[PDB]
């Protein structure tokens, strides 16, 4: 039952040192961070996860610089930040799944490179 401020896709070029893929859930209802879970999915793969209960972030070695500003989670911001090398290597469709207690939701953003 989580909802989102959807963006269909975000663009970036060779000028981009960093890449933001936005994720904004609108009806978040948690007051502490330990109930919230965040997962980013790319080609069937959990390329970023934040397990709020444990304060643990985990990335595969090929998304080594992928991150999220945990300071913005309760406010609804789950946006992903990457360096340019991990992005330009993994353009396509991303899924953002946020879990607050039993409440769960998903939203989709395409990362596109302009040449």
């Amino acid at each position: 039952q989580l909802l989102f401020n959807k963006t269909k896709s975000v663009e970036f070029t060779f000028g981009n040192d960093t890449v933001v893929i936005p994720c904004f859930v609108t009806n978040m209802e948690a007051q502490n961070t330990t109930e919230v879970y965040v997962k980013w999915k790319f080609k069937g793969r959990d390329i970023y996860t934040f397990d709020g209960a444990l304060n643990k972030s985990t990335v595969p070695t090929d998304f080594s610089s992928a991150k999220i500003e945990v300071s913005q989670l309760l406010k609804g911001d789950a946006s992903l930040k990457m360096d340019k090398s991990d992005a330009v290597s993994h353009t396509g469709n991303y899924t953002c799944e946020v879990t607050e207690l039993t409440r769960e939701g998903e939203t989709i953003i395409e990362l596109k490179y302009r040449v």
Partner: antibody
Amino acid sequence: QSVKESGGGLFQPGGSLRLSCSVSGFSLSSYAISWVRQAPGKGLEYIGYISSIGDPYYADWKGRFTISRDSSTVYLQMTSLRAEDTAVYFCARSYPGNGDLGRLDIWGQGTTVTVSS
Amino acid sequence: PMLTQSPSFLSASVGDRVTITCQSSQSVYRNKYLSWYQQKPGKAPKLLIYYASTLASGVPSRFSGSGSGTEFTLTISSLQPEDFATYYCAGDYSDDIENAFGGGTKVEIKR
């Protein structure tokens, strides 16, 4: 909300298997469709799925599969058939639209494909 | 992530209890993404339990899934002949190429 699979039957080793899963009462924009098979006398074998944004992904093996979809049906296509493809094939609705194996909840009745000369 | 279930010989009388373990070589996503399914002969599988312990709508509460990480268990209490079936666990993992079922455990009602 329900799914329905097309007829299977006898398939020659030179033939190509094409199975359609017609869903109704729900949208493919909101759910993943999963294909499962079962050799006669054996266990459920997870083939793969196609997510709710239309992208397919496949498990770790033997077979050459291609899952596709249109507005209202999902097709499993197999090639280079083998005796070990002889199974009852199931399509099922998967909840995390992203395709995680959360729950398979609306299953088809299933159809038997026999690979034999 | 190969899943190993209890070898298929689980028995109990009407009212008795049966236990079926499902082991995973890799721990499942979020330690709890494990579903239980019931298949009677010739029928499609029916979902019983998901997220390890949540029951599908309409499944009697005598089906009880517990465990975490790499180890799960399906307890069928108050057994009845309507429970003669084979039972599969299914796991999700951080790459979907590994999602799989267990091998199945058949339950047999003693009368």
